[PDB]
């Protein structure tokens, strides 16, 4: 059993769609990126604005906080990929290589690399401190909407507008497996924290798969909308956020949809805090909504 | 997904614990039995008292409405088993045979028999119109708390204080299979409407099994209290009612507990109406509580 989630706090300040959200490893603050071209750092406990980081010239599509270093990484529709030093509160590195808009990113848990995914149909692997390109993961035939890393092989998983999922060999920089089941564009991928399974979302279905080869488990059906985000906690609460503002909460193992949250409406990104007691959403109505168990 | 259930109406009138509840085939009214020794007929739409049937000298433990005839059957701790003619609103038949308190009953869907279960460790099969004993189902070593019928073999299923479930051959009047898994007294049995599976409840676990031989499927864990009742609808909503007043709602197939309803507290019996839109509970606080989807 998972207790229901209820709206606790609504955080405003952005002047356009909030496209991305991430929580720092120490759980003290969270970061958001927006269509207004800004990155904002908010205090988690209070919901107050700490800092506003400027530099992007188009929508900020991805934000992530480093565990290894006091860094924050961001990416945008302006093709820019930046490393922000959180001790100096300024950009220290630019990762050049994407041919068009950068849609998302992830950090590798064991290798000091940043992985970005783009409208250019690639995912790119960058050495954090030297900015050097490690590999350009080419194989998708359309925009790569989502990318996730893990320590175990396959180390990189991508979801694409080509309606496929690719499982990559990080060392060789090659596709190990291509999963074609989704009938429509894949915009979200989530890895279960126990490392045995993962899920992907498209309007036709949310699909659950087994590592390492991507054996299909089951469909999580009922969220008949454009799925923008998928996030899961250690307790097994899977959250699917849709472009029409709807949010479905599921039990990971059973695939059962336990809660349906009602809603320019839309949910672009979801994240749990480090304690997993708070669910933070980034929405089209220019706000961040905070949910807690009740 | 199953929408949550919320309290819609509270029906009072009984002067003691409400031990049993049943809905008529035409869905116009429902019947309850109580520790105050009365049987009450209430209008379903309004919740108003229609008739009060008197005759039992101890707690009424079971009530059921016939589909074949305009009859209502009742049983009690006074060892009495009665057939009430609903056209005349009076007792027309007494079924004699139980050696002690009668705990429950059920009607067979194809054979014109009434089945009762008792403190005497038996379940008894009675021909409705002649009152003749068809079979005395002996095999349990303690009180038989619950009994259910079905057209397919095994036609009769009993749950006992001996911690076992017995699957019976109605024709021979013999046990086909004895299920011993429960560590504690079994007080509730429910048959899934599709006829492939069934469930049983004890404080240690709610267990789900396959027909015809009772192959164990899974445990529905988390309702750590004395389970008095189990009821399921065609949509897959399983309701478990406890002696401490707690009610857990589950998805039948997955076994996932989706809702936990808070509470002399106690739930003795649960029943869905014919439309399955209403959940009616019979409680220790002397009331009938009506729940609807919200
Ligand atoms: Cl640079
Ligand atoms: Cl990992
Ligand atoms: Cl596999
Ligand atoms: Cl499936
Ligand atoms: Cl809901
Ligand atoms: Cl008689
Ligand atoms: Cl049947
Ligand atoms: Cl079986
Ligand atoms: Cl189990
Ligand atoms: Cl609940
Ligand atoms: Na993104
Ligand atoms: Na009963």
UniProtKB/Swiss-Prot annotation, chains A, B:
Role this protein plays: Involved in pre-mRNA splicing as component of the spliceosome. Component of the PRP19-CDC5L complex that forms an integral part of the spliceosome and is required for activating pre-mRNA splicing. As a component of the minor spliceosome, involved in the splicing of U12-type introns in pre-mRNAs.
Alphabetical UniProt keywords: Acetylation, mRNA processing, mRNA splicing, Nucleus, Phosphoprotein, Repeat, Spliceosome, WD repeat
First and last residues of every WD repeat: 13-52, 55-94, 97-136, 139-178, 181-221, 222-260, 264-294
Parent-record interval covered: 190 to 492 of 514
Family per record: Belongs to the WD repeat PRL1/PRL2 family.
Domain of life (superkingdom): Eukaryota
Signal peptide residues on this chain, from the entry's feature table: none
GO biological process, one term: protein localization to nucleus
Organism of provenance: Homo sapiens
UniProt keyword annotation of Nucleus present: yes
Source taxonomy: Eukaryota, Metazoa, Chordata, Craniata, Vertebrata
GO cellular component: catalytic step 2 spliceosome; fibrillar center; nuclear membrane; nuclear speck; nucleoplasm; nucleus; Prp19 complex; spliceosomal complex
Sites bearing Phosphoserine, chain numbering: 12, 202
UniProt protein name: Pleiotropic regulator 1
Subcellular location(s) per record: Nucleus; Nucleus speckle
Subunit structure: Identified in the spliceosome C complex. Component of the PRP19-CDC5L splicing complex composed of a core complex comprising a homotetramer of PRPF19, CDC5L, PLRG1 and BCAS2, and at least three less stably associated proteins CTNNBL1, CWC15 and HSPA8. Interacts (via its WD40 repeat domain) directly with CDC5L (via its C-terminal); the interaction is required for mRNA splicing but not for spliceosome assembly. Component of the minor spliceosome, which splices U12-type introns. Within this complex, interacts with CRIPT. Also interacts directly in the complex with BCAS2 and PRPF19.
